[PDB]
Amino acid sequence: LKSSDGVEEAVALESQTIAVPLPNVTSKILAKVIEYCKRHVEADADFMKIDQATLFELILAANYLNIKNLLDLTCQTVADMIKGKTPEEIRTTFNIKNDFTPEEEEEVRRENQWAFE
Q: Which residues make up the interface to other proteins (CB under 8 A)?
A: 52-53, 56, 59-60, 63, 71-72, 75-76, 78-80, 82-87, 90-91, 94-100, 104-105, 107-117
Contacting residues for 25 by C-beta, under 8 A, at least 6 apart:
3, 4, 33, 61, 64, 65
State the amino acid at position 97 in one-letter form: K
Task: Pick between residue 17 and residue 56 the one whose CB is nearest to other proteins.
Answer: 56
- Answer yes or no: are the C-beta atoms of 4 and 27 closer than 8 Å: yes
Query: In angstroms, what is the minimal distance from the CB of 56 to other proteins?
Result: 4
Query: In angstroms, what is the minimal distance from the CB of 41 to other proteins?
Result: 21
Query: In angstroms, what is the minimal distance from the CB of 44 to other proteins?
Result: 16
Query: In angstroms, what is the minimal distance from the CB of 10 to other proteins?
Result: 28
- Answer yes or no: are the C-beta atoms of 47 and 36 closer than 8 Å: yes
Task: Pick between residue 11 and residue 63 the one whose CB is nearest to other proteins.
Answer: 63
Rounded CA-CA distance 62/25 in Å is 9
